[PDB]
Design a protein around this ligand. Sequence first.
Ligand SMILES: [Mg+2]
Ligand SMILES: [Mg+2]
Ligand SMILES: [Mg+2]
Ligand SMILES: [Mg+2]
Ligand SMILES: [Mg+2]
Ligand SMILES: [Mg+2]
Ligand SMILES: [Mg+2]
Ligand SMILES: [Mg+2]
Ligand SMILES: [Mg+2]
Ligand SMILES: [Mg+2]
Ligand SMILES: [Mg+2]
Ligand SMILES: [Mg+2]
Ligand SMILES: [Mg+2]
Ligand SMILES: [Mg+2]
Ligand SMILES: [Mg+2]
Ligand SMILES: [Mg+2]
Ligand SMILES: [Mg+2]
Ligand SMILES: [Mg+2]
Ligand SMILES: [Mg+2]
Ligand SMILES: [Mg+2]
Ligand SMILES: [Mg+2]
Ligand SMILES: [Mg+2]
Ligand SMILES: [Mg+2]
Ligand SMILES: [Mg+2]
Ligand SMILES: [Mg+2]
Ligand SMILES: [Mg+2]
Ligand SMILES: [Mg+2]
Ligand SMILES: [Mg+2]
Ligand SMILES: [Mg+2]
Ligand SMILES: [Mg+2]
Ligand SMILES: [Mg+2]
Ligand SMILES: [Mg+2]
Ligand SMILES: [Mg+2]
Ligand SMILES: [Mg+2]
Ligand SMILES: [Mg+2]
Ligand SMILES: [Mg+2]
Ligand SMILES: [Mg+2]
Lengths: 196, 140, 97, 118, 105, 288, 95
Amino acid sequence: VAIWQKNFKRISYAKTKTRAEVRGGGRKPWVQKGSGRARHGSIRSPIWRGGGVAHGPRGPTSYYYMLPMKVRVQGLKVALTVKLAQDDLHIVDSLELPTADPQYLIELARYRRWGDSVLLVDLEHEDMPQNVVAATSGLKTFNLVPAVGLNVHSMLKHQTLVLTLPTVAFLEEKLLWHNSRYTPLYPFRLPYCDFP
Amino acid sequence: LRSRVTDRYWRVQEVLKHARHFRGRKNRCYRLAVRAVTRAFVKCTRARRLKKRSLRTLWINRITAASQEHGLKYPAFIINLIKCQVELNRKVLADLAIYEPKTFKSLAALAKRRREEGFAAALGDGKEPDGIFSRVVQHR
Amino acid sequence: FHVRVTLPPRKVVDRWNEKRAMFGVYDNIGILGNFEKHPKELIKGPIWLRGWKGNELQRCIRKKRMVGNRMFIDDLHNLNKRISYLYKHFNRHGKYR
Amino acid sequence: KFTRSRIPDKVFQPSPEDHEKYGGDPQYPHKLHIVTRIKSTKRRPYWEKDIIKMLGLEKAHTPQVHKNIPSVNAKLKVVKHLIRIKPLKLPQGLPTEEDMANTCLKSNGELVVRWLLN
Amino acid sequence: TARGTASRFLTSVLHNGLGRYVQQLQRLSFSLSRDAPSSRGAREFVEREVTDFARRNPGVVIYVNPRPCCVPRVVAEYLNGAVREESIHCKSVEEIAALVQKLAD
Amino acid sequence: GPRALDLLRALPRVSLANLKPNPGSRKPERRPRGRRRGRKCGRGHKGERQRGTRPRLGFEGGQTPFYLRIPKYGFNEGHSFRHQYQPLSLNRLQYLIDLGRVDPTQPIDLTQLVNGRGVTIQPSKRDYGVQLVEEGADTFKAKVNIEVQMASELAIAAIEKNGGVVTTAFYDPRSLEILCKPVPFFLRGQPIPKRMLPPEALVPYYTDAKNRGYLADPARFPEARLELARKYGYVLPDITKDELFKMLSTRKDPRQIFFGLAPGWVVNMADKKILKPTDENLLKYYSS
Amino acid sequence: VTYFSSRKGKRKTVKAVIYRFLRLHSGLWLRRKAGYKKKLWKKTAARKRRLREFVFCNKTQSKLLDKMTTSFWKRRNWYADDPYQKYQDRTNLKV
RNA sequence: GAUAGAAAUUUUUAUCCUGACGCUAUAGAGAUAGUACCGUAAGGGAAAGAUGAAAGAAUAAAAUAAAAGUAAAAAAAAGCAAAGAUUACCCCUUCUACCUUUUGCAUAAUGGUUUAACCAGAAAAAAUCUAACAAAGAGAACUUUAGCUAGAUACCCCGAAACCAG
RNA sequence: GCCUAACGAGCCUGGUGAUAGCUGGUUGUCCGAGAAAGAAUUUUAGUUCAACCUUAAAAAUACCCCAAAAACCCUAAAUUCCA
RNA sequence: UCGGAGUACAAAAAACCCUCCGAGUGAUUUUAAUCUAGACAAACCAGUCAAAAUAACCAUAACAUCACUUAUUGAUCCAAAAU
Ligand SMILES: [Mg+2]
Ligand SMILES: [Mg+2]
Ligand SMILES: [Mg+2]
Ligand SMILES: [Mg+2]
Ligand SMILES: [Mg+2]
Ligand SMILES: [Mg+2]
Ligand SMILES: [Mg+2]
Ligand SMILES: [Mg+2]
Ligand SMILES: [Mg+2]
Ligand SMILES: [Mg+2]
Ligand SMILES: [Mg+2]
Ligand SMILES: [Mg+2]
Ligand SMILES: [Mg+2]
Ligand SMILES: [Mg+2]
Ligand SMILES: [Mg+2]
Ligand SMILES: [Mg+2]
Ligand SMILES: [Mg+2]
Ligand SMILES: [Mg+2]
Ligand SMILES: [Mg+2]
Ligand SMILES: [Mg+2]
Ligand SMILES: [Mg+2]
Ligand SMILES: [Mg+2]
Ligand SMILES: [Mg+2]
Ligand SMILES: [Mg+2]
Ligand SMILES: [Mg+2]
Ligand SMILES: [Mg+2]
Ligand SMILES: [Mg+2]
Ligand SMILES: [Mg+2]
Ligand SMILES: [Mg+2]
Ligand SMILES: [Mg+2]
Ligand SMILES: [Mg+2]
Ligand SMILES: [Mg+2]
Ligand SMILES: [Mg+2]
Ligand SMILES: [Mg+2]
Ligand SMILES: [Mg+2]
Ligand SMILES: [Mg+2]
Ligand SMILES: [Mg+2]
């Protein structure tokens, strides 16, 4: 999952010009025989100095692949499990903050020995407390993300995870549904019997 | 992603450091040095193999010299030294010849005496008459 | 092989900037969001590569099919030549056949 | 065409003088063969190579013990020009389980059971 | 290559081993890091066997220096005045112990 | 249980610095560099192979190819116009019923089977529905009203011994895809079309009573039921006296697709509404 | 064989193989004997029977036909009253 | 035959979140420039820059003195120029330069004066490995009598006389 | 013959990265095993199979092979099959 | 292109612009079927045999026969046939 999150978003904008795309090189520079030098065709051959590249990178390359659903969900479960097991996962309630001081959070983390980086996870985006928003808008190692923004790469990048209790319930109900679900006859976006 | 080689200096130097004592352009030009270094290493291996043979021949020549200096031929000296259960290799025999003239003369006298003992035994063709130095001792 | 004689300035790059902190944050948007949007919509780039992958010939064909009518003259000609060359090399050339 | 060679039975009919020439017992045959490979299987036919391989004689100048049965005697006759064969001699009898680690094979063709006593 | 490199005769310093044996290794200075993943072998050797080696050989002065370094090194300085610097970069504890014993010997 | 979790406590932090894939999951790629993989780079010596100009697959060097010397014969002749029927075993039907994927209390249709994931139908592959086979007719003990497109006498007898109802109907590909995927059709935004009649090749199959044709004469049905009962030696149950007789007798109109719906209705799922035509011409067309 | 098409970029198939061959789902291929309709008056009854009889293809020709045909022809097929439905599968293959 | 190849019928949700696991002066546009120059013309078409805060600090200051080519410092019997060595540079002994093509090359068969920078393996149908789920698999369309999905394993460069159109 | 220093048919641009069974080249280390040709082919300057061989996986028999056995006017070295 | 003899002496195979015979069909009636084990040969395509069981004649054979009997023959596609 960590490799997939890094790779599937990649589109390499590396395009070099082959011998057919270089400007000139439309005629033979010299006749085949009698000159005494090596035989050549277009002066834009890859052997020549100003010639094109033999293979090189060709056009925008889209590195895109989709891992299966039960592999991505399992990776999320394993990330949560290892974070809990290594004493790096902390459950906080309601994510309330007494003051908008960004330095207060740093002192709280240092006193609780959370580490260098902390990822706070909230349930919703518009329901975030403005105190926490203002506190984490100026901090680098402390990152505030909503419940739909949880990912293995960020969970491994940040040393400590902090989850709100409704977020814990939300993640629980999201991850436990794939254990006993059908294969999608049509995409789960469209209305189902029990699924929204 | 254009990838170029930056340690080409060290790659060339790792080969050129073994060719600095060569003569001509082989000690400077890299194209001429790789072939010279490879042949140098091949010759080094071949000569390491031949060094044992060359030194053995040198030791044999020295043992001869010191043997006909005592009026004894090398094959007779060697066979009669073996017959006396004296298992000294050619290197040690040459060392004794160069640095221990008296010990080498004693060895030559013993080998000769064994030679006349064998000759007398062959002439006599008798089971009972046996020489003093011709007796064979078993392992203990 | 002449290497530079001076040390280059050390590139002081921070691993905790905005992009390196927010990278891949919404990759599980579908999984954790009552499926409404695939991770396809999060792919930013050319129109013909938003959630697609293929070899050079397939990429060229797809590019010509979608944006081929809006191309420039010289790039369209180069694309046609490249398509022809890739077709010929892929179908008539090779070892395993 | 070069093929395998049939050896007539008259070759293996020992003469009365052969026994005292080669130190063999004319009336009890010996029990075991000590077989050593002298020459190489290079420039030799593939069937001879296979016989040498199946006789366990890959490494030259290394003795191997075999039975005195006609089944192995046939192959020994096939490759008899590449090997030296001696009769195994047991002056002190078969080695028991207590003398397995103190045995030796002297070059004269005998197996000593008590070797290097202290 | 003999003709390419230098050569010397079989010699011993101070006619060592004649009157008494003196360990020719004088000091061993390890330079490592506490945060570099490459210095894992050096760190674990320091935790485990540096004390046992020091007790076994009291005639060698052992220095250990943690510092922000990427290539863990060991500098052995002998009674001859000779300084041999070896790299212990990404080697297991068994290999480090073998190298230290070789340097001492 | 999972002692790896306990072992993880002593181990350091799991981060992006220390991540290793499965040993053997990724076979390393080999490039034509070096003494071994260089020197013609695995392409061999001169010829067409090294220069990459060897002929196509079936070509044999001017000789008449094997795939061109064998005479043509009809094997796939009209393969894209032959009707296909996915088989459903009575053992699998029993498995579905007893695991609860499908319920015998309600009428079971191809829609219900698809919803319960018992069968998969691909209309674009010329599939014409689900047929019934008798792989597990020995241990079939469920009383279920089955509607399929093709049925065998043994399967029909096995169902009737328990006391179910078997009926075979026809579906042209459009009505078939609508029935397999009603939800994608309901968000399509079109009224439900009529069910087309079977072609002349299938009219006799659905007009007879022995195969339980949906267009057959219902008064001939008890005769054929009694024939099968006397042939297979099982007592024919009095189905009219069962509590689920209405469910067992629930049918579909030959022009109707679903259960209880009518052709021409628009199912607005957003407002949970049904829009029905009122025009005389529209009603005549939809009921013709 | 077109490994990469020009329009869709997919892998095409040769129509001769599908016209004069039949693939069973077990991996075997079915074909007719060559010359079963030519000069029947000149041939013996046993030879005519051999010509009329169906035959199989070995591993090399089977692999060639698999390479030359797309995976669409390798699907599982349930035809109505299919004569080869009984031959689609393999039984008692101790390998 | 090589090959070509639809359609009926389906899916596609508004805006920002846009920059770069693209190059750094033999690379990246040919470009400092379609300019010099070569051509009657159509046309072809380059190489060239490096101190510093200040050169209104040129009795001007600091880092390499590292490629090939020379000087410091021409050479002393004998030999693919090297190795074994040796107190000692040679002198002694031993090895028929390297790739390519060939049954076979020191061959007097081909290629290269030297240095620097560029210059040549690319595709996932069937299969192996790994992993998820498994009579089911896949984030929509298909495949399924242990199978479906995902990932990793694969297939070069230069060279004609020629043909057509303007 | 000449048609701007090469005319059995000019030069430039484009098709064009024309095509070559033909020649040349194909760039790091080490380790394991390792092949000289039967049949087709406008084919013998090449391809496609078979026999060999390489990496994996299932099994159980595999080479040497005594008798006995393999044609009829004469026929050697010796072959095939098996304990 | 196909067959026979020697080369190729005794299971099989084995080449030359090696030495010789031939074949690209005739005559007659016993007008010589269907289906299927198991085998020969063979790169493939092709060529060969064939036990049991069925239809019609003795109620006991049917391999069509002879000419050195071995060769007397041609693949797809396509055209004409009309089952
Ligand atoms: Mg061009
Ligand atoms: Mg041109
Ligand atoms: Mg020249
Ligand atoms: Mg050209
Ligand atoms: Mg340029
Ligand atoms: Mg360029
Ligand atoms: Mg040795
Ligand atoms: Mg590759
Ligand atoms: Mg490879
Ligand atoms: Mg190679
Ligand atoms: Mg090379
Ligand atoms: Mg060739
Ligand atoms: Mg032909
Ligand atoms: Mg299906
Ligand atoms: Mg043709
Ligand atoms: Mg430039
Ligand atoms: Mg210089
Ligand atoms: Mg000399
Ligand atoms: Mg070559
Ligand atoms: Mg020649
Ligand atoms: Mg060759
Ligand atoms: Mg010559
Ligand atoms: Mg030459
Ligand atoms: Mg030549
Ligand atoms: Mg060359
Ligand atoms: Mg030259
Ligand atoms: Mg694949
Ligand atoms: Mg033409
Ligand atoms: Mg002219
Ligand atoms: Mg070419
Ligand atoms: Mg050719
Ligand atoms: Mg090897
Ligand atoms: Mg060879
Ligand atoms: Mg026998
Ligand atoms: Mg046997
Ligand atoms: Mg056979
Ligand atoms: Mg019969």
